[PDB]
């Protein structure tokens, strides 16, 4: 039932990143019409706009020139068949 290619882990996967460059949160899904939301802990929902934050179902979320606001615990969520699935990532600089 799970829509994410990679499986859920209680320990978030680490994503190395650099301010000013491209950051990819790789929560790709199995079909193109699955709805996926991106969250930043604690108080944010990251909204794809087609330009700086872009959704690609075969890759994940792609963020142009990530800013210090993207340093942290980010989560992808999708609800398929009434079940809420999540995948956690932790970004880390140098």
């Amino acid at each position: 039932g799970r829509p994410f290619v990679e499986m859920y882990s209680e320990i978030p996967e680490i994503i190395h990143m650099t301010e000013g460059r491209e950051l990819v949160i790789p929560c790709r899904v199995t079909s193109p019409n699955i709805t996926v939301t991106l969250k930043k802990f604690p108080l944010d929902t990251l909204i794809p706009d087609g330009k700086r934050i872009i959704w690609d179902s075969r890759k994940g979320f792609i963020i142009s020139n990530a800013t210090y606001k993207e340093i942290g615990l980010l989560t992808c969520e999708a609800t398929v068949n009434g079940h809420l699935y999540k995948t956690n990532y932790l970004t880390h600089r140098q």
Binding site: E10, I11, P12, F41, P42, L73, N88
Partner: peptide
Amino acid sequence: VKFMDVYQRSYCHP
């Protein structure tokens, strides 16, 4: 204490 709980309880806050 599980990782996610330590992380959430320690992150910057009042």
